[PDB]
Design a protein around this ligand. Structure first.
Ligand SMILES: O=C(O)CC[C@@H](O)C(=O)O
Ligand SMILES: O=C(O)CC[C@@H](O)C(=O)O
Ligand SMILES: O=C(O)CC[C@@H](O)C(=O)O
Ligand SMILES: [Cl-]
Ligand SMILES: [Zn+2]
Ligand SMILES: [Zn+2]
Lengths: 147, 148
């Protein structure tokens, strides 16, 4: 429920997400179908509304990354992200609460999410992996985690 | 290889996920492993060297080696995830090792794949450790004709 002296624990979640979600983005770039695109795009639209009404932004952020995991068409990726759901909520909600005290930083975060969608849409697995890990490295650096 | 289409898809899915998880674990282990971690990995490799008598024991020492690499990340969540996947690991590893015993000398070749991961981690070389880990899983998937 907080994060002052919990940085090393946050760093452990983000560092694991970097290997899982980079791999999921690259798989999704190869296997996504029209139904997957709609799931990611609907999450991205709901995330555009939270730029002004920030309630449930954590659920929609998570739903976006879960939609990428579903787009791999690999049941074990999906089950791993559901198994780690509590850690995702901890990391996401900590990162978003921190982000909303600055700028349109929330809008810079929204762009990082869109960049992963865009590379998955193009079917470019290397670009998708790099965009997914950059989102996590930038979220960690915004939290001063030092991975 | 003889497998239903769904079995081949399931095996390909396990190896796909392992490549991302275990490639990352090996890179982290190359940074963080201590002398106890090295002992645990070498203990599994030594047990694997005495292979002939029973394959069922061979499967468990293979999984224990990969789990030891995950524990050597010193990341609470990596180790837990590999335990969570213990049934999928045993499925993949038992299918693979049974298949490799069909070709004379193949099991010794596979053993050098495990040594290469251990050696990279011992040397503290993350990029080398990641490559050896993913290459082991790529070759296993290809021995099984999974067409990843
Ligand atoms: O950096 C943020 O504010 C949000 C990061 C969040 O979207 C995440 O997936 O960790
Ligand atoms: O070990 C568990 O807790 C559940 C195992 C799960 O990965 C499964 O194989 O269905
Ligand atoms: O390919 C083999 O013969 C064994 C593969 C096994 O070591 C594994 O970790 O999946
Ligand atoms: Cl072996
Ligand atoms: Zn996010
Ligand atoms: Zn192995």
């Amino acid at each position: 429920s907080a994060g002052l002296d919990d940085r090393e624990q946050l760093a452990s979640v983000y560092e694991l997400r970097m290997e899982l979600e980079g791999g999921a983005a690259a798989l999704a770039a190869r296997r996504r179908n029209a139904t997957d695109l709609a799931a990611m795009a609907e999450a991205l639209a709901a995330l555009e509304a939270n730029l002004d009404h920030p309630e449930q932004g954590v659920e929609h952020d998570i739903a976006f990354h879960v939609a990428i995991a579903a787009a791999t068409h690999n049941r074990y990726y999906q089950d791993l992200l559901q198994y780690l759901n509590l850690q995702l909520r901890l990391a996401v909600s900590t990162a978003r609460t921190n982000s909303r005290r600055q700028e349109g930083l929330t809008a810079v975060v929204h762009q990082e999410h869109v960049a992963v969608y865009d590379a998955i849409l193009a079917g470019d697995p290397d670009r998708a992996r790099l965009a997914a890990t950059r989102h996590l490295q930038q979220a960690a650096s915004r939290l001063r985690l030092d991975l």
